[PDB]
Design a protein around this ligand. Structure first.
Ligand SMILES: Nc1ncnc2c1ncn2[C@@H]1O[C@H](COP(=O)(O)OP(=O)(O)OC[C@H]2O[C@@H](O)[C@H](O)[C@@H]2O)[C@@H](O)[C@H]1O
Length: 166
């Protein structure tokens, strides 16, 4: 309903401004999967993510932070902090799903009005960015996509997402 599915790689450039939403661990490790791709392409955004993880660590769970990509003023990154650790040590499915909802709720709040690193780098009003994501939680975090999709659909009327499927 509020989700629009598209086929392809989310990192292929888009002419419109957007926020790339990615589910993250709190341990400062963009180590694998799509996070690693973000670390290679946007290393200054990675440095911000590591800095926040080092300052607050696992107390970030259920929050999100918005980061400039730095390389493209039409691209921001939204980290959803949904697991203390990445890889095999990631959290249990229900924990990740609850943190995914709470973090998406901070994003919705911020768009209606998390943004410390956007100072001086935000090109447009934060509401003008389209919300896009891969199938978050369904790779390294092991959560069936249908269960995340329901979480997304709870924000019907408040937020719309474009979800990329390879
Ligand atoms: N450019 C890409 N474009 C579109 N979809 C992609 C892309 N890369 C991966 N995907 C899809 O998105 C799914 C989720 O990617 P993951 O990186 O495995 O993310 P997630 O399941 O949310 O686990 C997050 C964990 O892994 C790291 O990304 C992060 O550090 C965190 O610890 C993958 O299974 C994959 O199918």
């Amino acid at each position: 309903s509020n989700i629009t599915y598209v086929k392809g790689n989310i990192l292929k450039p888009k002419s419109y401004a957007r926020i790339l939403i990615a589910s993250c661990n709190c341990n400062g490790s963009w180590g694998g999967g799509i996070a690693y791709q973000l670390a290679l392409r946007y290393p200054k955004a990675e440095k911000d993510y590591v800095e926040v993880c080092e300052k607050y660590g696992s107390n970030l769970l259920g929050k999100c932070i918005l980061l400039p990509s730095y390389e493209n003023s039409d691209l921001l990154i939204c980290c959803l902090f949904t697991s203390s650790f990445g890889g095999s040590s990631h959290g249990e499915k229900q924990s990740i799903l609850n943190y995914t909802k709470l973090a998406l709720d901070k994003l919705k709040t911020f768009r209606e009005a998390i943004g410390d690193y956007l100072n001086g780098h935000i090109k447009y009003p934060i509401g003008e960015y389209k919300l896009e994501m891969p199938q978050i939680n369904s790779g390294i975090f092991g959560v069936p996509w249908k269960e995340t999709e329901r979480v997304l659909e709870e924000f019907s009327g408040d937020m719309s997402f474009t979800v990329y499927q390879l």
